[PDB]
Amino acid sequence: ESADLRALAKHLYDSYIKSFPLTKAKARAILTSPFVIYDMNSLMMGAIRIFQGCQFRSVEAVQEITEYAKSIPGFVNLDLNDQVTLLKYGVHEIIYTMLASLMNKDGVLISEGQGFMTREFLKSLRKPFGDFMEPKFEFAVKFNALELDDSDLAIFIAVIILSGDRPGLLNVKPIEDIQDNLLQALELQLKLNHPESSQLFAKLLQKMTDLRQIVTEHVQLLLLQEIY
Amino acid sequence: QLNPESADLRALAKHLYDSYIKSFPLTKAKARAILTGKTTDKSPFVIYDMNSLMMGEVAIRIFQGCQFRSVEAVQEITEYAKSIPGFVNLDLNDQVTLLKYGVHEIIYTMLASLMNKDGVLISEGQGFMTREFLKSLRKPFGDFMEPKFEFAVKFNALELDDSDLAIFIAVIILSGDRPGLLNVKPIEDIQDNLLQALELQLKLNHPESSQLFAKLLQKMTDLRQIVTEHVQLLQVIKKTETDMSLHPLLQEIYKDL
Ligand SMILES: O=C1O[C@H](c2ccc(OCc3cccc4ccccc34)cc2)C(c2ccccc2)=C1O
């Protein structure tokens, strides 16, 4: 069985690379030369306008995530409504996962890494804008201390999408069966890639709690308008 | 065959199951025995309406009883937690922090053991109160137990028995991502050991059960949600029912949760 699992993991990893331009390996190299937004004069040279821009980029993400999901073995063979339902409820969770790749404790890469917007400047935004990104920063510092890389996140992202508990699925069985196989593939992946990281698998799963917590909290704070 | 590492995880499993039996007078095993007619001596009285309530013996009188059941559950969980190796060795402040946030998640975990899709065991298993009688209570008391039922039916589908739950509720208590924790690292190393012990336990007790470990852990999402929903509904109760008194042990657990 362990053969197909490695083959599943590599399959997911290649697809992840093709679907997501800005990988985690790339983002970290940059964070360790982008234009820095630390202030208002800084931003101009680069409140409502900032929050709408996160919206624009979030919409582009969903298309990337959607393309990635269709590479997940068995995903397209699912009931079409079930596919739509899985992406509908899954993309927020995936966006925050992947946003963590672009953050450190001091700020976030924007514009596919061409910029960097400081955590402090974000906080300085008047209410309720100045509070939308602080909880994601809190989650990212926790998340990134796991030091996953892109081949780990490729499987992780796939497991999130194949969640058999989205509201209103029609045929939960093949979803959980795929998720079952993805979890097996994640577990072996973490074991070979992090032999020293004890029970990394378990601590990763526990972050879905956190992730879902962020997503519900974000929702609450929340023609062109047609597009969003 | 099993090695010295496995053998230490097995002994921690045995020790926690043992303490669990000593701390919780109504186990799942007994609850299931009562709910499924393995009884001629253990069958419960069934409350499904006002006269059946009257016969065993409103929406506040029920609520005051579930809330003082909760208090003596906190005590049982508190007794069980002291038995988790390393728990009492941690900073006293963290000990209370771990209890403050963990108690509710464990209470609804264990409450599931007393539930089927149709109702819930009460008064140590002597009684059984139907899901319908509860959902029929005046607002917002009718909204009280429905999320718990919905959790339980999914959670009960995992078919965990008590030796599993003992380790799982120990993983819950020893949660290093709790608000305000002084020393997270000693907490994580205990939970890391619990997680190893749960992982082996699930694989030995449920070998035909693919990825039960992962599926069990993902249920922590559902508990956190039950807790959140419960707090909100308690917020509403305090405004509409200012003559209703909540219990101090429980006051302290909700302050800034
Ligand atoms: O212009 C912008 O870019 C920014 C940005 C927004 C979301 C974002 O999410 C990261 C991300 C989310 C989902 C899928 C991805 C796939 C590949 C790489 C990153 C992916 C990344 C950059 C961004 C922005 C604005 C406000 C707060 C945070 C970021 C812009 O104003």
XYZ file of C-alpha atoms and ligand atoms in Angstrom:
516
model
C 0.000 0.000 0.000
C 2.847 2.350 0.922
C 3.807 2.580 -2.754
C 0.575 4.211 -3.926
C 0.660 6.537 -0.899
C 4.044 7.986 -1.893
C 2.674 8.215 -5.439
C -0.403 10.058 -4.207
C 1.769 12.486 -2.201
C 4.075 13.274 -5.120
C 1.038 13.648 -7.426
C -0.500 16.156 -5.047
C 2.836 18.002 -4.647
C 3.367 18.510 -8.381
C -0.225 19.739 -8.852
C 0.189 22.107 -5.881
C 3.257 23.605 -7.550
C 1.456 24.144 -10.846
C -1.668 25.634 -9.257
C -0.077 27.934 -6.726
C 2.409 30.417 -8.171
C 3.831 31.621 -4.823
C 4.976 28.506 -2.972
C 5.905 28.382 0.692
C 9.537 27.642 -0.139
C 9.554 30.815 -2.244
C 7.727 32.997 0.308
C 10.112 32.084 3.153
C 13.233 32.810 1.097
C 11.789 36.309 0.509
C 10.879 36.879 4.154
C 14.417 36.023 5.279
C 13.679 42.621 -2.271
C 10.067 43.588 -1.592
C 8.633 47.061 -1.207
C 7.590 47.515 2.437
C 4.294 49.111 3.545
C 4.685 50.254 7.145
C 2.769 53.537 7.036
C 0.266 55.628 5.050
C 2.976 57.367 2.993
C 4.489 53.924 2.492
C 1.120 52.586 1.235
C 0.582 55.459 -1.228
C 3.988 54.863 -2.810
C 2.978 51.237 -3.263
C -8.616 51.211 4.834
C -11.580 50.350 2.655
C -9.129 50.064 -0.238
C -6.964 47.584 1.679
C -9.841 45.346 2.737
C -11.269 45.275 -0.805
C -7.830 44.279 -2.136
C -7.749 41.233 0.125
C -11.156 40.473 -1.408
C -9.792 40.738 -4.968
C -6.843 38.468 -4.205
C -9.112 36.047 -2.310
C -11.226 35.638 -5.468
C -8.132 34.781 -7.527
C -7.134 32.254 -4.883
C -10.455 30.413 -5.156
C -9.804 29.788 -8.848
C -6.343 28.456 -8.062
C -7.676 26.301 -5.210
C -10.489 25.054 -7.508
C -7.993 24.037 -10.161
C -5.919 22.276 -7.516
C -8.913 20.370 -6.109
C -9.750 18.939 -9.531
C -6.343 17.265 -9.510
C -7.172 15.444 -6.267
C -7.741 11.782 -7.291
C -11.451 11.046 -7.264
C -12.527 14.645 -6.758
C -14.051 15.246 -10.206
C -15.779 11.858 -10.140
C -17.941 13.173 -7.266
C -21.511 14.414 -7.650
C -21.144 17.878 -9.211
C -23.184 19.563 -6.468
C -20.937 17.857 -3.910
C -17.840 19.286 -5.630
C -19.366 22.777 -5.520
C -20.324 22.286 -1.854
C -16.814 21.087 -0.886
C -15.156 24.120 -2.534
C -17.764 26.517 -1.211
C -17.131 25.624 2.417
C -13.457 24.715 2.020
C -11.854 27.729 0.367
C -11.846 30.012 3.416
C -9.994 27.396 5.439
C -7.527 26.881 2.566
C -6.995 30.637 2.139
C -5.979 31.075 5.789
C -3.803 28.004 5.656
C -1.948 29.383 2.689
C -1.884 32.958 3.986
C 0.260 31.631 6.871
C 2.897 30.646 4.308
C 3.108 34.360 3.443
C 3.258 35.706 6.996
C 5.714 35.981 9.827
C 5.157 37.698 13.207
C 5.917 41.074 11.614
C 3.728 41.140 8.487
C 2.494 39.531 5.274
C 3.741 39.257 1.703
C 1.329 40.844 -0.751
C 1.319 41.103 -4.567
C 2.793 37.625 -5.038
C 5.688 38.644 -2.866
C 6.441 41.954 -4.569
C 5.375 43.748 -1.377
C 5.294 43.240 2.388
C 2.664 44.891 4.565
C 3.713 45.158 8.180
C 1.625 43.706 10.963
C 1.767 47.018 12.809
C 0.531 49.079 9.889
C -2.413 46.642 9.526
C -3.267 47.049 13.204
C -3.256 50.834 12.822
C -6.323 50.702 10.607
C -9.413 52.231 12.213
C -12.154 49.875 13.473
C -13.208 47.252 12.478
C -10.588 47.011 9.727
C -7.659 47.067 12.143
C -8.830 43.786 13.651
C -9.406 41.597 10.566
C -5.801 40.474 10.118
C -4.550 40.292 13.726
C -6.305 36.915 14.374
C -4.820 35.452 11.172
C -1.369 36.620 12.355
C -1.956 34.886 15.680
C -2.922 31.689 13.868
C -0.026 31.883 11.383
C 2.653 32.217 14.079
C 1.209 29.120 15.732
C 0.754 27.326 12.397
C 4.191 28.070 10.972
C 5.954 26.822 14.151
C 5.121 23.385 12.751
C 7.539 24.153 9.895
C 5.553 22.317 7.286
C 6.801 22.639 3.755
C 4.944 22.649 0.430
C 4.868 18.873 -0.026
C 3.277 18.615 3.436
C 0.800 21.425 2.766
C -0.176 19.880 -0.604
C -1.704 16.865 1.209
C -3.056 18.935 4.130
C -4.917 21.181 1.704
C -6.429 18.144 -0.028
C -7.672 16.691 3.328
C -9.444 19.987 4.123
C -11.280 19.939 0.791
C -12.447 16.307 1.252
C -14.348 17.122 4.436
C -17.376 14.841 4.641
C -19.106 17.239 7.029
C -19.813 20.223 4.802
C -23.467 21.261 5.079
C -25.645 19.624 2.458
C -23.438 17.041 0.800
C -25.407 14.396 -1.069
C -23.070 11.387 -1.065
C -20.685 11.555 1.926
C -19.217 8.069 1.423
C -16.779 8.675 -1.473
C -15.684 11.944 0.126
C -14.699 10.307 3.433
C -13.161 7.420 1.523
C -10.974 9.884 -0.423
C -10.225 11.796 2.768
C -9.330 8.492 4.405
C -6.733 7.860 1.661
C -5.466 11.452 1.882
C -5.017 11.200 5.635
C -3.023 7.983 5.223
C -0.924 9.788 2.648
C -0.441 12.783 4.946
C 0.565 10.592 7.885
C 3.298 8.765 5.961
C 4.411 12.075 4.469
C 4.890 13.667 7.889
C 6.635 10.548 9.172
C 9.239 10.479 6.375
C 9.643 14.268 6.171
C 9.725 15.010 9.908
C 10.958 11.818 11.619
C 11.939 13.902 14.643
C 8.658 15.859 14.890
C 6.758 13.702 17.359
C 3.044 13.287 16.640
C 3.165 16.005 13.989
C 0.218 14.362 12.259
C -1.969 14.840 15.340
C -0.970 18.479 15.965
C -1.703 19.272 12.314
C -5.264 17.858 12.593
C -5.823 19.916 15.765
C -5.158 23.071 13.734
C -8.401 22.495 11.840
C -10.226 23.509 15.001
C -8.224 26.735 14.937
C -8.779 27.149 11.188
C -12.543 26.689 11.418
C -12.512 29.052 14.377
C -10.817 31.760 12.302
C -13.271 31.210 9.437
C -16.405 31.625 11.540
C -14.845 34.651 13.311
C -13.956 36.209 9.937
C -17.492 35.728 8.636
C -18.859 37.616 11.633
C -16.561 40.627 11.260
C -17.502 40.818 7.527
C -21.815 44.692 -10.574
C -18.301 44.636 -9.170
C -20.134 43.696 -5.972
C -21.761 40.989 -8.059
C -18.292 39.506 -8.643
C -17.838 39.120 -4.848
C 5.578 -7.809 18.480
C 5.381 -4.998 21.049
C 8.585 -3.194 22.108
C 9.451 -1.245 25.305
C 7.994 1.990 23.860
C 4.649 0.353 23.047
C 4.631 -1.227 26.504
C 4.905 2.212 28.183
C 2.031 3.603 26.078
C -0.062 0.545 27.059
C 0.584 1.129 30.766
C -0.426 4.761 30.458
C -3.635 3.594 28.700
C -4.330 1.161 31.548
C -3.627 3.791 34.233
C -5.915 6.387 32.638
C -8.755 3.854 32.055
C -8.474 2.747 35.696
C -8.605 6.370 36.972
C -11.537 7.059 34.600
C -13.436 4.147 36.178
C -12.618 5.504 39.626
C -13.711 9.075 38.798
C -16.869 8.720 36.672
C -19.677 6.686 38.281
C -21.729 6.384 35.020
C -19.581 4.860 32.302
C -20.526 4.442 28.651
C -20.605 0.650 29.187
C -23.329 1.060 31.826
C -25.108 3.742 29.792
C -25.248 1.469 26.728
C -26.356 -1.426 28.932
C -29.254 0.700 30.211
C -30.222 2.141 26.802
C -30.366 -1.201 24.922
C -32.422 -3.516 27.195
C -29.468 -5.532 28.483
C -31.735 -4.691 31.456
C -34.654 -6.154 33.451
C -33.131 -4.546 36.564
C -31.716 -1.404 34.917
C -34.489 -0.071 32.623
C -35.194 3.671 33.065
C -38.348 5.653 33.640
C -39.065 7.665 30.489
C -39.978 11.373 30.606
C -41.517 12.540 27.341
C -44.243 14.971 28.475
C -45.408 17.015 31.497
C -47.236 14.219 33.292
C -44.346 11.815 32.787
C -42.162 14.626 34.122
C -44.591 15.002 37.037
C -44.452 11.206 37.581
C -40.678 10.945 37.999
C -40.615 14.280 39.864
C -40.457 23.803 34.561
C -38.062 24.679 31.779
C -35.983 26.495 34.408
C -36.528 23.691 36.903
C -35.077 21.349 34.296
C -32.297 23.834 33.448
C -31.326 24.293 37.114
C -30.980 20.488 37.257
C -28.831 20.128 34.162
C -26.674 23.007 35.470
C -26.136 21.424 38.894
C -25.436 18.109 37.159
C -22.763 20.080 35.281
C -21.183 21.231 38.562
C -20.782 17.720 39.943
C -19.433 16.694 36.504
C -16.758 19.406 36.783
C -15.780 17.850 40.112
C -15.516 14.378 38.578
C -13.464 15.697 35.658
C -11.330 17.652 38.157
C -10.733 14.421 40.100
C -9.820 12.589 36.888
C -7.405 15.302 35.727
C -5.224 15.063 38.877
C -4.537 11.450 37.848
C -3.137 12.441 34.456
C 0.621 11.971 34.916
C 2.321 15.391 35.182
C -0.911 17.302 35.536
C -0.475 18.237 39.176
C 3.250 18.987 38.566
C 2.346 21.907 36.294
C 2.070 25.494 37.394
C -1.126 25.814 39.490
C -2.278 28.704 37.272
C -2.094 26.561 34.171
C -3.864 23.676 35.982
C -6.864 25.962 36.473
C -6.548 27.317 32.939
C -6.582 23.789 31.520
C -9.647 22.951 33.624
C -11.519 26.166 32.800
C -11.592 25.522 29.045
C -11.423 21.734 28.994
C -14.365 20.920 31.281
C -17.072 21.834 28.791
C -15.504 19.936 25.939
C -15.237 16.832 28.082
C -18.744 17.168 29.488
C -20.305 16.989 26.002
C -17.938 14.204 24.988
C -19.126 12.124 27.926
C -22.745 13.266 27.660
C -22.785 11.613 24.232
C -22.236 8.264 26.035
C -25.597 8.871 27.704
C -27.349 9.720 24.397
C -28.984 8.042 21.449
C -30.883 9.821 18.665
C -34.071 9.676 20.822
C -33.025 11.039 24.254
C -30.587 11.240 27.160
C -29.995 9.311 30.400
C -30.616 11.362 33.566
C -30.318 10.943 37.335
C -27.430 8.460 37.047
C -29.320 6.382 34.460
C -32.548 5.940 36.473
C -34.367 8.313 34.126
C -34.469 8.945 30.374
C -35.607 12.242 28.935
C -36.613 12.212 25.284
C -35.047 14.614 22.806
C -38.568 15.738 21.878
C -39.643 16.733 25.365
C -36.539 18.938 25.612
C -36.884 20.478 22.157
C -40.456 21.355 23.121
C -39.391 23.630 25.981
C -40.100 27.362 25.994
C -37.605 29.538 24.224
C -34.739 29.612 24.521
C -34.660 26.548 26.808
C -35.860 24.366 23.928
C -32.718 25.289 22.006
C -30.515 23.984 24.836
C -29.806 20.313 24.157
C -30.352 20.019 20.377
C -26.713 20.768 19.391
C -25.570 18.193 21.985
C -27.830 15.546 20.442
C -26.569 16.333 16.968
C -23.004 16.020 18.180
C -23.706 12.781 20.056
C -25.234 10.878 17.111
C -22.206 11.648 14.920
C -19.819 11.127 17.833
C -21.510 7.887 18.899
C -21.019 6.635 15.359
C -17.294 6.291 16.117
C -18.195 3.465 18.617
C -15.594 4.460 21.171
C -15.667 2.526 24.373
C -14.542 3.781 27.779
C -10.862 2.747 27.460
C -10.761 4.968 24.361
C -12.581 7.895 25.942
C -10.302 7.935 29.016
C -7.269 8.674 26.835
C -9.181 11.088 24.610
C -10.505 13.220 27.426
C -6.918 13.340 28.774
C -5.735 14.703 25.399
C -8.448 17.333 25.698
C -7.501 18.584 29.176
C -3.836 18.830 28.223
C -4.397 21.373 25.480
C -1.486 23.769 25.094
C -3.430 26.225 22.899
C -5.622 27.433 25.793
C -5.945 31.183 26.439
C -3.464 32.516 28.986
C -1.119 29.551 29.458
C 2.106 30.436 31.270
C 4.110 27.352 30.305
C 2.885 25.748 27.127
C 5.864 23.431 26.550
C 5.411 21.105 29.593
C 1.731 20.859 28.592
C 2.598 19.894 25.006
C 4.997 17.157 26.105
C 2.308 15.555 28.249
C -0.309 15.823 25.470
C 2.283 14.501 22.998
C 2.540 11.369 25.179
C -1.241 11.074 25.552
C -1.573 11.361 21.745
C 0.908 8.542 21.259
C -1.027 6.503 23.811
C -4.405 7.255 22.193
C -2.965 6.440 18.767
C -1.786 2.974 19.823
C -4.994 2.415 21.787
C -7.240 3.165 18.811
C -5.185 0.923 16.564
C -5.281 -2.032 18.971
C -8.915 -1.628 20.007
C -10.235 -0.730 16.510
C -7.903 -2.343 13.989
C -10.560 -2.570 11.278
C -11.332 1.131 11.788
C -9.364 3.130 9.240
C -7.926 6.464 10.514
C -10.184 6.541 13.586
C -7.390 8.499 15.298
C -7.605 11.297 12.743
C -11.429 11.178 12.692
C -11.595 11.297 16.488
C -9.236 14.299 16.622
C -11.273 16.235 14.008
C -14.255 15.934 16.350
C -12.526 18.523 18.550
C -13.829 20.957 15.956
C -17.397 19.960 16.822
C -16.943 20.322 20.574
C -15.497 23.814 20.313
C -18.608 24.702 18.310
C -20.993 23.227 20.905
C -19.235 25.239 23.628
C -19.445 28.472 21.625
C -23.129 27.993 20.867
C -23.809 27.157 24.506
C -22.126 30.342 25.777
C -24.198 32.519 23.441
C -27.436 30.904 24.608
C -26.354 31.416 28.219
C -25.767 35.088 27.416
C -29.400 35.329 26.253
C -30.716 33.532 29.350
C -29.032 36.056 31.689
C -30.966 38.922 30.082
C -34.454 37.338 29.819
C -34.157 35.385 33.104
C -32.579 37.736 35.678
C -34.308 35.773 38.461
C -32.415 32.624 37.393
C -29.183 32.053 39.304
C -26.189 30.375 37.736
C -23.789 28.324 40.037
C -20.453 29.938 41.076
C -18.115 27.094 40.014
C -19.810 27.565 36.608
C -19.653 31.379 36.754
C -15.890 31.161 37.020
C -15.644 28.814 34.036
C -17.512 31.260 31.754
C -15.813 34.556 32.757
C -13.937 35.582 29.576
C -14.099 32.188 27.834
O -2.645 42.342 -3.502
C -2.652 41.708 -2.448
O -2.133 40.457 -2.341
C -2.416 40.232 -0.955
C -2.681 38.912 -0.637
C -3.997 38.625 -0.240
C -4.371 37.347 0.080
C -3.424 36.359 -0.053
O -3.779 35.099 0.265
C -2.610 34.293 0.081
C -3.079 33.322 -0.708
C -4.395 33.010 -0.439
C -4.996 32.021 -1.175
C -4.290 31.421 -2.207
C -2.963 31.734 -2.476
C -2.283 31.069 -3.497
C -0.952 31.407 -3.773
C -0.308 32.392 -3.016
C -0.995 33.056 -1.990
C -2.331 32.722 -1.722
C -2.116 36.641 -0.466
C -1.707 37.928 -0.774
C -3.073 41.331 -0.356
C -3.488 41.467 0.940
C -4.217 42.586 1.364
C -4.611 42.752 2.692
C -4.232 41.824 3.660
C -3.477 40.716 3.289
C -3.093 40.566 1.955
C -3.183 42.234 -1.338
O -3.761 43.452 -1.280
